[PDB]
Amino acid sequence: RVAEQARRRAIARAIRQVPIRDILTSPVVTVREDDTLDAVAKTMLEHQIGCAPVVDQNGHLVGIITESDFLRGSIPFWIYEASEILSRAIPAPEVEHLFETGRKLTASAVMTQPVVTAAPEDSVGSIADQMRRHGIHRIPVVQDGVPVGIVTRRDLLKLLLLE
Amino acid sequence: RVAEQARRRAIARAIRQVPIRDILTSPVVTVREDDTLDAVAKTMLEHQIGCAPVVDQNGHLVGIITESDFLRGSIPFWIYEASEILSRAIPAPEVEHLFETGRKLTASAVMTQPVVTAAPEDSVGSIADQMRRHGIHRIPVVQDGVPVGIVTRRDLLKLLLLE
Numbered sequence: 046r047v048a049e050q051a052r053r054r055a056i057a058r059a060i061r062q063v064p065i066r067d068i069l070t071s072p073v074v075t076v077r078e079d080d081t082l083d084a085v086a087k088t089m090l091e092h093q094i095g096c097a098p099v100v101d102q103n104g105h106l107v108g109i110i111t112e113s114d115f116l117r118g119s120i121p122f123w124i125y126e127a128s129e130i131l132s133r134a135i136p137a138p139e140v141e142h143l144f145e146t147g148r149k150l151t152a153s154a155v156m157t158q159p160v161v162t163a164a165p166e167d168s169v170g171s172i173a174d175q176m177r178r179h180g181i182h183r184i185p186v187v188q189d190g191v192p193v194g195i196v197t198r199r200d201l202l203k204l205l206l207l208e
Numbered sequence: 209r210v211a212e213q214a215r216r217r218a219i220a221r222a223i224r225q226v227p228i229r230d231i232l233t234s235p236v237v238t239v240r241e242d243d244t245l246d247a248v249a250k251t252m253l254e255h256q257i258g259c260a261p262v263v264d265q266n267g268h269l270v271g272i273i274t275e276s277d278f279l280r281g282s283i284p285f286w287i288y289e290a291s292e293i294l295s296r297a298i299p300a301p302e303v304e305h306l307f308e309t310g311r312k313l314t315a316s317a318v319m320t321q322p323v324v325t326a327a328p329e330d331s332v333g334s335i336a337d338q339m340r341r342h343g344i345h346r347i348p349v350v351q352d353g354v355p356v357g358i359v360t361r362r363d364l365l366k367l368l369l370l371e
């Protein structure tokens with residue numbers, strides 16, 4: 046019983062010392078702050094992702110955008126996935142109005158500012174601590190100014206408990 | 209300005225009246241309460257899902273299991289995705305011990321009980337209300353005792369704000 050605990054303790058400590066870059070196993074997909082929401086939705090759906098770093102024209106991080114952010118512009122992100130299903134609920138000219146609005150607004154209009162960022166050489170444990178300390182759900186990873194990923198609470202729960 | 213608000217109001221109202229069964233657009237994948245965690249991991253990774261209803265031998269819902277639940281048995285789910293990366297952190301006999309444990313524990317040993325369930329004829333608004341009121345992140349949809357889906361907070365945020 047005691048030895049089992051020592052065993053568990055050592056695994057947990059090892060896991061906290063894993064560098065962030067080791068858990069960034071997907072390619073980073075970003076969007077431009079000037080991309081229209083229509084283009085962002087296409088990009089997200091085409092790569093099967095629900096959030097993305099927003100960068101300026103020269104590739105520097107300026108914000109984060111998620112599906113839920115579309116509601117800040119009064120657009121439900123689902124319109125890009127299932128307009129036919131939603132057209133059963135909402136009349137056609139109103140659906141078209143949502144699309145027209147998505148073609149006008151940009152990522153910059155609804156993105157958020159990240160409260161904290163991490164570097165690829167930071168440890169899993171240090172990022173977990175950030176996550177719990179600010180009670181947030183996503184943290185962008187930046188290497189030399191350039192986004193190289195977003196770490197989510199779901200990613201970390203594959204490795205360790207979060208308080 | 210006033211006219212736009214009426215427009216947005218009617219859209220928001222329409223969205224709350226969409227029946228749940230309209231948003232269950234993916235096929236339900238379940239696991240058995242007696243499946244080993246090794247098999248559960250395999251199922252979830254084959255189907256690219258992070259949670260699943262747990263059913264009994266005759267198919268009735270008995271629980272919910274997610275990747276994070278593996279930690280309840282002291283196994284990091286990531287071991288099933290990236291054991292080679294984890295082995296740079298953890299000696300090989302210890303990783304093997306994790307695998308051994310996963311082949312012994314079953315879904316029933318780590319699954320959770322759902323505080324609330326929904327029926328497919330219920331509305332989006334009503335399940336959204338359930339989410340916030342119980343402050344939960346996932347709700348199983350059941351049609352005649354049989355799971356037909358799991359609705360998450362992420363799903364709902366494609367449609368409407370929560371609290």
Ligand SMILES: [Cl-]
Nearest residue numbers: 118119120146
């Ligand atoms: Cl609008």
Ligand SMILES: [Cl-]
Nearest residue numbers: 182197198199
């Ligand atoms: Cl998350």
Ligand SMILES: [Cl-]
Nearest residue numbers: 053281282309
């Ligand atoms: Cl163990």
